[PDB]
Amino acid sequence: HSAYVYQLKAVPDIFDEISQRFPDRVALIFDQRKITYRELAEQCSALAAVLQNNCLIKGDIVAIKIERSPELYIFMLALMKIGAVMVPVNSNSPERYIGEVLSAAGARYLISDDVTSVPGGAWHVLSSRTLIQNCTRSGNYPVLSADDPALILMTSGSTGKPKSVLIAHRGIARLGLPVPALGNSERDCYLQIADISFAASANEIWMALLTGACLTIAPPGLPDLMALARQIESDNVTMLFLSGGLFRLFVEVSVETLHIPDCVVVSGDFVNPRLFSVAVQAGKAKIFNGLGCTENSAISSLYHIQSPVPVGTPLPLVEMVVFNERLQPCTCGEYGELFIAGAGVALGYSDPQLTAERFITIPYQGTDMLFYRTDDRATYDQDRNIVLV
Template sequence: MTSTTTLRPHHKHWPRRLPHAITPPATSLWDNLAVSARRYPDKAALIFFGRQTSYRELCEGTERLAAYLHSIGVRKGDRVILLMQNCPQLVLAHFAILRANAVVVPVNPMNLADELQHYIQDSEARTAIVSAELASELAKASNGLAPAQRLQHMLVTHYTDAFDAGVSGPDAPPAAWASWLTAQHPLPALEGGSVHGWAQALACSAAPPALEVGPDDLSMLPYTSGTTGLPKGCMHTHRSVMHNVEATGLWVTMTPETVSLGVVPMFHITGMVALLHASIFSSVTVVLLPRWDRDLAGHLISHYGVTHWLNIPTMVIDLMASPHLDRYDLSSLVFIGGGGAAMPQAVAQRLFEKFQLHFAEGYGLTETAAPSHFNPPDEAKLQCMGIPWLSTDSRIIDPENLQELPIGEQGEIIIHGPQLFHGYWKQPEASAQAFVELEGKRFFRTGDLGRMDEDGYFFITDRLKRMINASGFKVWPSEVEMLMFRHPAIAEACVIAARDSYRGETVKAVVVLRQEYRGKVGAEDIIAWCREHMAAYKVPRIVEFVDALPKSGSGKVMWRLLQEAEQNKP
């Protein structure tokens, strides 16, 4: 470890036990699993509805699956789509893709066929690993593409491949989950390709290919949206992810005795890096939940003595509102924190008064491999991004002249550090525009407006980019608009944020109908159509019809006027 970072205001609140910068291992991310398996072969790596997977089993499984992927043509640098909820198969498949020298393309399982086509087409993936209840939607997406763009192989797993569907007692899943968690789905037809079963793949007896990837090879291609166009792939190497993997363990004090609640989605950059990879690096035991359920979460924390819970604040709000809260023993928790939305002060106060737990908020982006800022667990401030963490420099600049601003002034947040992505996949112009040079260092422009206080803590105040934060899910209006324009009745649409007492923000669409549909298509019709064509969290909850959208002299929709009018509503 080194400590070469120039002293900044936040260093006076720096955890004394930590250096300002670190030197991560110069190895592949898969090596982290191999090391943990050698050190703790019989230790539980994963617990899923009562079934434990040891580090040895997990590591051996990744090698068999990597061998199978190699046998069907996956080679170094190939992109492989990974589409499923949190489960042991996601962890195993993720590391198997890395072990096969390939690149993980994590995709949100809430996406529908219209959205999934972009991930297949843009990443040029020819292989996908998917859970059975999502396989038909992915096949539908692939089958709708030109033959040269389609998937060639789809590997399908059922959740019951990783647990006993008949499990009872405290480890049983909620009864309401039975229909999707234990259902057996027929394998879909993949036009021009082959569909493979999970058991068949894990029975592979061939040797895996030689491990050829190292720190500077591409490891994953998570997608992020922006102000215009479709989602863009963020190129992360093993090195850029490795930094935040080790940094997470150090910051929140992960050890091999840590038990973590794995409920933050692992397709998302935060769950993928700060939960999945950080846990494997530190030989942690992860208790997995495929979806959020407040009472199941409370039970699992109590039953397994969970010590670390990375989450979205809305999860804590939900658990604290449970009528069964007094049944749960949360005394084992030593760290609770997360990001994606601000933690209300009243909830944080109740959390502390009842359980003596401080909620530590953090901030990160897909481009920064999750955290770039985090509150020191012992000196956390509420509604605050935290401080730039290990090896990271962050400034506030004037977005127009790109000059650094004094303490307390609002400007654009920029970030420099080893966790930064290497640019957007196949988009050199967008990549160039995403960075700015300051004092000889390359900083990423976040598009978020904020300020830094005298202690060096950062606070978000506004956004330069259009983005809606609904319960921690980032919704990009331009993407929703592009999908809505496919509706035959919609002439124009502008998507903005509306206040929501639970989600923080929700999606609102201001719509101009084509003349022939006026009076014939209602808001519920539009919402129902959206539910069929986009992920649930992107669907507008509110649709307002207008005769025309406000436009500038150049014909651009003036979305800010609509957003400001919405914000000014009583």
């Protein structure tokens, strides 16, 4: 439990720390089933021992296709504890496409809650249901470092090129640091709705579970705004992360739901400023425009809208710089490209040539800093907020 904020542990070590400090806080809610950190840590450890005894070891590439459920997050924590590299799969994807993802990721195993609706291939299919039943063993787990790989996520460039992104423990472990703009703590409650195959899901999962906060879990499948509205109220969601689609739809059909939480973060793409205007005038929740990208593991900057919206200022341990064509920091109003450095930067792509092109070391403020090149055109405003253009 170090006070040096730049000193990060692997995910399982942070979670062990949190589960010891807040053992009687609620970690997970699904429907009306609630699970404390103490019970979650017991289930995580029991499952990790089962996985190790199934010969799964550090660095094994392990895909997960498990519908939203408490067991999904138990598997994530157990796989992190044994050092496996998770490949989360979109359960709403054609089997065809899932096979292409598993192939591109090099998955050796696929853990599934429905072993009938999975693609065949080189990978070996394991039943999440059977493995959970075999929980009764725990010890001799790997000594993980913040730079060990934790997951593989798929993304695309601006012109459609598909990419396989290797994410380090540190990229999600940083979400255990409270975000000053949000004021979050263990008292908060998050809503898990973004699909696990999307980096944005990390915002919900790990900001909750690595801080002692509560994660209430949306029902599997496509968004049910009626149920989500009831869930936000009945489970007292206080930190609400939304895609541009979910945000816009809520503004259109139930803007007052957006003011049940304390903070609402909209990320993923440009949002019509008029939508922010309506939302901000409808109540007193803090509405943010947020930037994230897969290559920085999770949400990366926040702009509080008070009334092209800026993307604001970086999260803890994140560095953002707009660089011109000559790799010099831009002045206010000068156009350049957004580069991101710090704890969230990915380990690379599966493509080594693509990695060297997009992950570049640049001396900045006295440090030879590794930057991800976003391909996002940007500048600074007068208050030095970053604004994508």
